[PDB]
Curated annotation (Swiss-Prot), chain A:
One of its GO terms (molecular function) is U3 snoRNA binding. The gene is UTP6. The lineage of its organism: Eukaryota, Fungi, Dikarya, Ascomycota, Saccharomycotina. GO terms for biological process: endonucleolytic cleavage in 5'-ETS of tricistronic rRNA transcript (SSU-rRNA, 5.8S rRNA, LSU-rRNA); endonucleolytic cleavage in ITS1 to separate SSU-rRNA from 5.8S rRNA and LSU-rRNA from tricistronic rRNA transcript (SSU-rRNA, 5.8S rRNA, LSU-rRNA); endonucleolytic cleavage to generate mature 5'-end of SSU-rRNA from (SSU-rRNA, 5.8S rRNA, LSU-rRNA); maturation of SSU-rRNA; maturation of SSU-rRNA from tricistronic rRNA transcript (SSU-rRNA, 5.8S rRNA, LSU-rRNA). One of its GO terms (cellular component) is small-subunit processome. This is U3 small nucleolar RNA-associated protein 6.
Swiss-Prot record, chain C:
CDD domains: S4. One of its GO terms (biological process) is maturation of SSU-rRNA. Residues 108-174 form the S4 RNA-binding domain. Belongs to the universal ribosomal protein uS4 family. GO terms for cellular component: 90S preribosome; Mpp10 complex; nucleolus; nucleoplasm; small-subunit processome. This is U3 small nucleolar ribonucleoprotein protein IMP3. Required for the early cleavages at sites A0, A1 and A2 during 18S ribosomal pre-RNA processing. One of its GO terms (molecular function) is snoRNA binding. Keywords: Nucleus, Ribonucleoprotein, Ribosome biogenesis, RNA-binding, rRNA processing, rRNA-binding. The gene is IMP3. It comes from Saccharomyces cerevisiae (strain ATCC 204508 / S288c) (Baker's yeast).
Swiss-Prot record, chain D:
The gene is NOP56. This is Nucleolar protein 56. It comes from Saccharomyces cerevisiae (strain ATCC 204508 / S288c) (Baker's yeast). Interacts with NOP1 and NOP58. Component of the ribosomal small subunit (SSU) processome composed of at least 40 protein subunits and snoRNA U3. Its main location: nucleus. Present with 13500 molecules/cell in log phase SD medium. The keyword Membrane does not apply.
Swiss-Prot record, chain E:
Its main location: nucleus. Residues 1-11 have a biased composition (Basic and acidic residues). SUPFAM superfamilies: WD40 repeat-like. The gene is UTP7. GO terms for biological process: endonucleolytic cleavage in 5'-ETS of tricistronic rRNA transcript (SSU-rRNA, 5.8S rRNA, LSU-rRNA); endonucleolytic cleavage in ITS1 to separate SSU-rRNA from 5.8S rRNA and LSU-rRNA from tricistronic rRNA transcript (SSU-rRNA, 5.8S rRNA, LSU-rRNA); endonucleolytic cleavage to generate mature 5'-end of SSU-rRNA from (SSU-rRNA, 5.8S rRNA, LSU-rRNA); maturation of SSU-rRNA; maturation of SSU-rRNA from tricistronic rRNA transcript (SSU-rRNA, 5.8S rRNA, LSU-rRNA). Keywords: Nucleus, Repeat, Ribonucleoprotein, Ribosome biogenesis, rRNA processing, WD repeat. WD repeats lie at residues 90-131, 212-251, 254-293, 296-333. Interacts with snoRNA U3. Interacts with MPP10. Component of the ribosomal small subunit (SSU) processome composed of at least 40 protein subunits and snoRNA U3. This is U3 small nucleolar RNA-associated protein 7. Residues 457-478 are annotated as: Disordered. Present with 5800 molecules/cell in log phase SD medium. Involved in nucleolar processing of pre-18S ribosomal RNA. It holds the Pfam family BING4CT. One of its GO terms (cellular component) is nucleolus. The lineage of its organism: Eukaryota, Fungi, Dikarya, Ascomycota, Saccharomycotina.
Length: 374, 461, 182, 166, 535
RNA sequence: UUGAACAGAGAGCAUUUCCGGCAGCAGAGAUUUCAGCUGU
């Protein structure tokens, strides 16, 4: 039997752990009968990931007791013998066995990754790379594993090339969830922000732009639109032109709501050229979307983008020097909108007035602003 | 008074949930396990009896055989299941041994196809397509060497002009052929041994010791530039292709039918000759064989090595084949059949698990090298039982009761009667040489391993 | 005991936990099942007497074929066994080897005589009745099943008077005369 | 050597890694032919390394048509490029076992370092994983495979016949 | 690597009372490395051993251990063991011979009158209760609870699990002692006839009939180590028997009078025999020394038993008395009955019990539990004996929790690896070796040629004749012992040249005597006969 | 057949290059663990 093999693999560490005079024979027999129970429950039939988890918790508890007893008996913090790594190696092998048997519970896979990362200097980052590789092989569609893999290899190791490779491979696998798109534009903005801040720092002590984020923004719009028109209206295109235009309108609503979220969490990256990097998404949304977002319905979205293009310089604090510089730009925007619109004219006028009043002695310059926007 | 009894507690010994197996506590005390010699003696005896009832070695013949008896066989040393065979009526065939059916047949020559081997032909104008074409070339007594390509369904990468891509031509007949394992080269023995390459239509070099013909040929498998050949003047000649010359020859008593080189030791080879035994020779010292494999009763026709280099197979003119462990010198196993006549060709498949024999009634037959061994994949319990039984038969090997069972086979009537009259003849000559040695003064004790070399060029010091 | 597989049944063929060769095919059990014999050793107590008869019959057939000693003792033993009822015909002397048999001595037992005389519906019923003390041979009540009934002594196998079985057969044919108690 | 195995199925694509080769010469024998029926010995041959599930019945029907007419789709390209090692194109390609001899050319057109095998050894490896199915996958797919088979068969047939509900 | 408990796992080997071969030298070096690794790793399993043995310890000097009562044990120990300590009061049939299965799951009792019951004593499940109204004597299980053999009035019978009779053995004429050999599948039978019969249960075949030639067999025990049978006779003689040799392997003179009981340790090292001369005797089995001789018991010991942990349970009628560590070499382990003035070097009883009504019939320890089942005149009583059982069984030799499927497959497997009855020797490790003939050096055929050479030249070199030597007191000269041990009537060339060499020896001794006494000088070696040589 | 730069794999092999020693100090995550400078 293989429980016999594993149990007698456990004996040299307790040889060493009895020789180093911290445990006695009668208590190490007790930890062996508990470990016998656990090994038999592991490699018998009807096994459970809770059996694996309880074995890992028991082995961590006897490791903590071993460390406590070592500090109290020998008054060293490690005996530099077999019995201080064998038990963590055992926990790692219980994790490997469990993930080979039940490779379906991401709770257990993430407990494996957490213990392997928190093992510290003693583990190897290529050993973490191996279990990231096989986990991403088994779950390519689950996207938080791609985010966690790239987050470990950028926010700990700062490996930009491999992080870009992870994000491009994940976007190859599931180019359908917008969350991976948003985390990729987030990673690219974080990388370019660290690039220009190390430039600023080398200047203060002693070309490559957000156009990467704009290009992945562009392919984000194109492929998310393609995958929504392929996901809905699923089997066939058996739908008349009313249902086809209803579908295409709804995909425009979907994609434009995601770009609204993109600008909403795009504004807080204010260390690069945030005006240019928001204005390029503005000009990428301003063009035609093949179903007349401006010249027909989604006119509310056209008014939303017009309000964004108006306040895109007026994204400011109550110190309104930019307003005193270019509020005539907002007035010309309201005039150019009300020169064409019918109820969106009154809506945009009242909305820009309410927005400027809410956002903006100090009340006397604000009395000038109220007389301006009255 | 303190007091303590055995608390068995029933949670550790019969499990709570019904889906899981019972605990098996062990206790390795020899007091607990008493008959440790008798118990594994009986397990070794039951293993030898189980082997003698599981010995079913004949897998199957392949195809419908040939029409006129198989005189040439060649495996290809890179694919597991492909086999080329040629008969006396000039037909050669290429075989898929998985389905036991021919890829193609070819009326190759008019005489006997006297040799055939396989190639990866290194042309320097074309590129060899070895994933869809296989190449076999073949020499006959109508003074021709022909090279053929075969359409092979082993990869499904592609989607074609199969036969006879070229025709080398000699002035006299050919008798053997073997291909170099690189560099587009082969060698043909016959009236004289020539070296060839697949580009030139004529021999590159004639490498003949004297004006005595050559009956067989084998290239080395590692140190690939060392050839060996058997000439009908009872001679075994080694050639080297760096020096482009012969190297050393020995003359034996009778005629070497075949050679095969050891694929794992690169200087050892085995010869199969007409006095009924095989000789294991070292290339660096041909003054003595380093084994003699004795158990055949007629002329040994062909020999081959296991690709593990650990055992040889040996088919002879008595209609039977024999498998020999390389360190022993007597037969580990004999395969016979009432349908098999005069096994002229034997190869050992690259799996090291099957043995291909070409007989002369026409048929090519598969056998298991280990008769009692099945070819399924095994769970660890049965794999552990099988290697436990192998180790146990090994360490009880010489007990009389299991030795008489493992030693036992059914041999035909003709081979059994030849065996017993061979025994009484050998016992008579040992009696007479013991008497003659008792009288006469200086009778040298010649070794069995030297008793079959009449001489050697390039003497040893 | 577990229906051995092919390699096991080939490897241990002579193994049998029930039928042995000393059992002789369980024929003590077989004929004591046939004739409903209570105790285990009655078969072998009869087998000793069959072996006596056949040992004497061998040693008596090994005499010359014409002498009056052999002819007198063969005829005398043949007459004795026919009169006792073990042999069913006193004609040929090969009965003294072939037809002398524990089943013949067992067919002469009291319940089998009863069942053949239609006095009980089966041999187990006859055993129960003569255990319950209903059957007398002659005047005296016979109480045990093993009682061997010779040919002249089977004319007197009846029921006891005041038997309930005798009463119910008489009252079945309503020939019951209560003057003589049944 | 039959190193990897590609099993297409209605829930997605599976790449298996061949642990132990089955016998080539004894491939018609009784024990070799019924070891693919016994599951306890088939799991000695085949191990699952990857399973990319589909995005829904739309991508399922797209990949069913591409697998039907023998083309490598984009999800196939993704899973094969994730799983198969970057072997050489001129010396010892990596060996993928497929079941479709005219899907093989489309795989080598995209990955020149991959030689594809669909002969009787790859065929009975493939039918072993077809015979066992849900047991090999260790619990990692959504959706019962026969329910997805019913949906995909009906969708494929109505597409192939142009079934209009008008 | 050191392993303080290795010598339990060590294995003895042959010794003569290094090599030039390179390949054989390295092969033997690998073999010694593997033996050391295997002994060390096998001895490291004592960590993995689950349970601990039982005990009871006095913790005071007023608290003796033999005066601890069974009710006090049953109060002090747990409810499961207290419920294992059963007691069946079966009054009407005779004294009950007790027997346990080799795992302690089933109990087989036999009344003297007729009452044989096979039962699961630890559940409440009996599976055979049969009243065989002739006087039964003994019974045993065969390889299971599924078959048992009973020794009846004369014949031994064999019954299945539910009690139907399978076999009546026409041999085994009057058994009083049955014992099964489980690795060999042999039912061994002895009794009032002076015969010992080994019967193969699997095939069905009587393997051996051996004349004891010493009257009825008074006691009988089996060595669990090497399966030889120790029978005790009315001579005071134990004899060790095997089914191969028609003579006893050994005959020991244990007691005076008859031998009432024999027990063997499961290690096959010690044997306790009680005689009817009020004498318990502890014997070494392997070297056949007599370790202890407890003479003058107060009444003759009617039974002995030895537990798996080496306790010694003697029973003398009403009394049962157990000694701990009595089977040891030292004289401080001689079992006493009191310690005269508190001597620590006196082995007082480990515990004792008095069956006040009756006289016990037999003793048997329950195999893997801490109990002693004694069968007596009014039934069965288990005694909680805390030191008295192997706490850590091996579950693939014999398992107390085994199921129906495990019983089936273990029955087939042990039936398959049944050891032949010829392999029973006095030591078990003597069936791999070479003969004790057939010279210990293997021969290389050069010396075979040399041996046939001197066999040719035994004549004219006299290598098969004793050598001539004059000074060896010629009444015991070797050559005359040859001449006298030969038959004095036939004349062969061998004895003719012994007579020649004897006359040569007598003449050399004559001239040596003459030059020692001084009558003749040195050589003068017959100056005319030296000239007449060539004639 | 070799060379070059490039892209890598974790799948091999050395050896004294450092660490698995101690503080002082700031930093990191949820009172435990984690991350670098000046000397023993």
């Amino acid at each position: 039997s293989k429980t016999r093999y594993y149990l007698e693999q456990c004996i040299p560490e307790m040889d060493d752990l009895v020789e180093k005079g911290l445990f006695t024979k009668n208590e190490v027999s007790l930890i062996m009968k508990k470990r016998t129970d656990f090994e038999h429950r592991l490699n018998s039939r009807g096994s459970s990931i809770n059996d694996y988890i309880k074995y890992i918790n028991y082995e961590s508890n006897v490791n903590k007791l071993r460390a406590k007893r070592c500090k109290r008996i020998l008054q060293v913090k490690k005996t530099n013998s077999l019995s201080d790594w064998s038990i963590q190696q055992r926990i790692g092998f219980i994790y490997q066995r469990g993930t080979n048997k039940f490779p379906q519970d991401l709770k257990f896979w993430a407990m494996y990754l957490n213990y392997m990362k928190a093992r510290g200097n003693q583990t190897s980052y290529k050993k973490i790379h191996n279990i990231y590789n096989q986990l991403l092989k088994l779950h390519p569609t689950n996207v938080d594993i791609w985010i966690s893999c790239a987050k470990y290899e950028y926010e700990v190791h700062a490996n930009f090339k491999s992080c870009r490779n992870i994000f491009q491979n994940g976007l190859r696998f599931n180019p359908d969830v917008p969350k991976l798109w948003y985390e990729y534009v987030k990673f690219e903005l974080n990388f370019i922000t660290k690039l220009i801040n190390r430039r600023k720092v080398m200047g203060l002590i002693n070309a490559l732009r957000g156009d990467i984020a704009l290009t992945i923004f562009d392919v984000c719009m194109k492929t998310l639109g393609k995958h929504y028109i392929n996901k809905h209206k699923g089997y066939y295109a058996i739908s008349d032109s009313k249902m086809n235009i209803e579908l295409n309108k709804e995909t425009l609503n979907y994609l434009f709501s995601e770009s609204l979220r993109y600008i909403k969490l795009f504004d807080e990256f204010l260390d690069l050229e945030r005006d240019y990097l928001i204005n390029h998404v503005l000009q990428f949304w301003k063009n035609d979307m093949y179903d007349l977002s401006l010249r027909k319905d989604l006119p509310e979205l056209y008014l939303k983008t017009v309000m964004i293009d108006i306040t895109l310089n007026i994204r400011y604090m109550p110190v309104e020097k930019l307003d005193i510089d270019q509020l005539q730009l907002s007035v010309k925007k309201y005039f150019a909108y009300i020169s064409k619109l019918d109820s969106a004219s009154v809506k945009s006028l009242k909305n820009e007035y309410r927005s400027y009043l809410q956002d903006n002695a100090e009340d006397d310059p604000r009395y000038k602003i109220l007389d301006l926007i009255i | 008074m303190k007091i303590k009894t055995i608390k068995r507690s029933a949670d550790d010994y019969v499990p709570v949930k019904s889906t899981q197996e019972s605990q098996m506590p062990r206790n390795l005390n020899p007091e607990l396990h008493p008959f440790e010699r008798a118990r594994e003696y009986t397990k070794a005896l039951n293993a030898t009896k189980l082997e003698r009832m599981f010995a079913k070695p004949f897998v199957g013949q392949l195809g419908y055989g040939h029409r006129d008896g198989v005189y040439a066989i060649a495996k290809n040393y890179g694919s597991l299941n492909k086999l080329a065979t040629g008969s006396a009526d000039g037909v050669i065939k290429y075989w898929n041994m998985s389905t036991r059916e021919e890829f193609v047949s070819f009326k190759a020559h008019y005489g006997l196809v006297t040799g055939l081997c396989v190639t990866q032909p290194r042309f320097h104008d074309k590129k060899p397509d070895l994933k869809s074409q296989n190449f076999m070339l073949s020499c006959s007594d109508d003074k021709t060497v022909k090279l053929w390509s075969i359409n092979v369904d082993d990869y499904s990468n592609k989607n074609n002009e199969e036969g006879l891509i070229r025709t080398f031509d000699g002035e006299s007949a050919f008798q053997g052929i073997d291909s170099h394992r690189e560099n587009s080269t082969f060698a043909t023995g016959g009236a004289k041994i020539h070296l060839w390459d697949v580009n030139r239509l004529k021999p590159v070099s004639d490498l003949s010791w004297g004006a005595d013909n050559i009956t067989s040929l084998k290239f080395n498998q590692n140190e690939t530039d060392i050839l060996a050949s058997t000439g009908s003047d009872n001679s075994i000649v080694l050639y080297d292709l760096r020096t482009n010359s012969p190297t050393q020859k020995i003359v034996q008593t009778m005629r070497t039918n075949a050679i095969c080189w050891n694929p794992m030791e690169a200087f050892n080879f085995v010869t199969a000759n007409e006095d009924h035994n095989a000789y294991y020779y070292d290339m660096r010292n041909l003054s003595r064989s380093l084994n003699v494999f004795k158990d055949h009763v007629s002329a040994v026709m062909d020999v081959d090595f296991s690709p593990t280099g650990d055992e040889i197979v040996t088919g002879s003119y008595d209609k039977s084949i024999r498998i020999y462990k390389t360190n022993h010198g007597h037969s580990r196993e004999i395969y016979h059949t009432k349908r098999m006549q005069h096994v002229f060709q034997v190869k050992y498949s690259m799996d090291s698990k099957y043995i291909i024999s070409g007989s002369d009634d026409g048929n090519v037959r598969l056998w298991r090298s280990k008769a009692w061994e099945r070819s399924n994949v095994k769970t660890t319990r049965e794999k552990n039982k099988l290697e436990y039984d192998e180790k146990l038969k090994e360490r009880f090997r010489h007990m009389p009761e299991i030795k008489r069972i493992s030693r036992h086979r059914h041999v035909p009537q003709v081979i059994k009667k030849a065996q017993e009259i061979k025994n009484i003849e050998l016992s008579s000559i040992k009696r007479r040489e013991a008497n003659e040695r008792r009288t006469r003064k200086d009778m040298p004790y010649i070794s069995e391993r030297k008793k079959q070399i009449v001489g050697t060029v390039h003497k040893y010091e | 005991v577990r229906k051995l597989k092919h390699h096991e049944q080939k490897l241990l063929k002579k193994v049998d936990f029930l039928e042995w060769k000393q059992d002789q095919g369980h024929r003590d059990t077989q004929v004591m099942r046939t004739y409903h014999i209570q105790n285990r050793e009655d078969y072998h107590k009869y087998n000793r007497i069959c072996g006596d008869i056949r040992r004497l019959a061998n040693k008596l057939s090994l005499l010359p074929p014409t002498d009056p000693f052999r002819r007198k003792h063969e005829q005398l033993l043949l007459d004795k066994l026919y009169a006792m009822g073990v042999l069913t015909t006193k004609s040929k002397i090969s009965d003294l080897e072939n037809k002398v048999t524990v089943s013949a001595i067992c067919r002469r037992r009291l319940p089998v005589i009863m069942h053949r005389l239609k006095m009980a519906e089966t041999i187990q019923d006859a055993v129960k009745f003569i255990e319950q003390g209903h059957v007398r041979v002659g005047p005296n009540l016979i109480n045990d099943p093993a009682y061997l009934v010779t040919r002249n002594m089977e004319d007197y196998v009846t029921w006891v008077d005041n038997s309930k079985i005798k009463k119910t057969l008489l009252r079945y044919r309503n020939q019951i005369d209560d003057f003589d108690f049944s | 050597p039959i190193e990897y195995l590609l099993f297409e199925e209605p829930t997605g694509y599976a790449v298996f890694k061949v642990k132990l080769q089955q016998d080539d010469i004894g491939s018609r024998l009784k024990e070799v032919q019924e070891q693919i029926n016994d599951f306890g010995a088939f799991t000695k041959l085949i191990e699952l390394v990857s399973f990319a599930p589909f995005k829904g019945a739309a991508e399922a029907l797209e990949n069913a048509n591409d697998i039907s007419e023998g083309l490598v789709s984009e999800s196939l390209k993704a899973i094969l490029d994730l799983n198969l090692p970057k072997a050489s194109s001129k010396k010892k390609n990596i060996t993928l076992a497929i079941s479709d001899k005219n899907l093989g050319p489309s795989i080598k057109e995209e990955f020149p370092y991959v030689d594809c095998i669909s002969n009787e050894l790859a065929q009975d490896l493939i039918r072993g994983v077809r015979l066992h199915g849900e047991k090999l996958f260790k619990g990692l797919q959504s959706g019962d495979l026969e329910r997805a088979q019913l949906g995909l068969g009906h969708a494929y047939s109505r597409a192939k016949v142009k079934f209009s509900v008008q | 690597k050191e392993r303080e408990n290795q010598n339990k796992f060590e294995r003895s080997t042959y010794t003569n009372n290094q090599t030039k071969d390179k390949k054989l030298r390295a092969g033997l070096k690998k073999i010694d490395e593997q033996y050391k690794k295997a002994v060390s790793s096998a001895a490291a399993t004592d960590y993995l051993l689950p349970e601990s043995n039982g005990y009871l310890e006095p913790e005071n000097e007023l608290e003796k251990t033999f005066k601890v009562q069974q009710s006090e044990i049953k109060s002090s120990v747990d409810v499961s063991t207290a419920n294992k300590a059963l007691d069946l009061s079966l009054k009407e049939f005779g004294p009950y011979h007790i027997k346990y299965a080799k795992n302690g799951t089933h109990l087989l009792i036999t009344g003297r009158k007729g009452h044989v019951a096979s039962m699961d004593w630890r559940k409440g499940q009996l599976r055979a209760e049969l009243f065989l109204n002739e006087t039964c004597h003994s019974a045993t299980y065969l390889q299971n609870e599924q078959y048992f053999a009973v020794a009846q009035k004369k014949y031994t019978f064999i019954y299945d699990h539910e009690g139907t009779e399978l076999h009546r053995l026409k041999q085994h004429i009057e058994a009083r002692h049955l014992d099964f050999l489980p690795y060999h599948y042999l039912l061994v039978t002895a009794g009032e006839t002076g015969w010992l019969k080994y019967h193969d249960v699997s095939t069905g075949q009587l393997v051996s009939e051996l004349r004891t030639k010493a009257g009825p067999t008074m006691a009988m025990a089996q060595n669990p180590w090497n399966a030889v049978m120790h029978l005790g006779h009315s001579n005071g003689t134990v004899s060790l028997w095997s089914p191969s040799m028609p003579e006893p392997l050994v005959k020991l003179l244990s007691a005076r009078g008859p031998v009432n009981s024999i027990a063997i340790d499961r290690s096959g090292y010690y044997m306790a025999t009680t005689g009817a001369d009020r004498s318990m005797k502890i014997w070494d089995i392997r070297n056949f020394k007599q370790l202890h001789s407890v003479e003058s018991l107060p009444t003759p010991g009617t039974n002995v038993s030895i537990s798996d942990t080496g306790l010694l349970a003697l029973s003398r009628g009403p009394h049962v008395t157990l000694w701990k560590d009595a089977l040891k070499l030292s004289g401080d382990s001689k079992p006493c009955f009191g310690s005269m003035g508190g001597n620590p070097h006196r082995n007082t009883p480990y515990m004792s019990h008095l069956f006040a009504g009756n006289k016990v019939e037999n003793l048997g320890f329950v195999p893997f539990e801490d109990l002693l089942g004694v069968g007596h005149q009014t039934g069965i009583t288990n005694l909680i004996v805390p030191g008295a059982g192997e706490a850590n069984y091996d579950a693939l030799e014999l398992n107390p929790f085994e199921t129906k499927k495990q019983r089936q497959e273990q029955e087939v497997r042990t039936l398959l690896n049944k050891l032949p009855a010829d392999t029973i020797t006095l030591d078990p490790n003597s069936i791999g070796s070479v003969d004790k003939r057939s010279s210990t050096i293997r021969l290389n055929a050069k010396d075979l040629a040399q041996t046939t050479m001197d066999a040719n030249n035994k004549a004219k070199t006299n290598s098969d004749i004793p050598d001539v030597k004059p000074d060896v007191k010629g009444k015991n000269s070797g050559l005359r012992s040859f001449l006298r041990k030969k038959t004095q009537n036939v004349i062969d060339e061998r004895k003719l040249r012994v007579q020649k060499q004897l006359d040569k020896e007598k003449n050399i001794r004559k001239r040596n005597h003459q030059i020692k006494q001084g009558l003749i000088s040195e050589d003068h070696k017959d100056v005319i006969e030296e000239a007449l040589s060539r004639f």
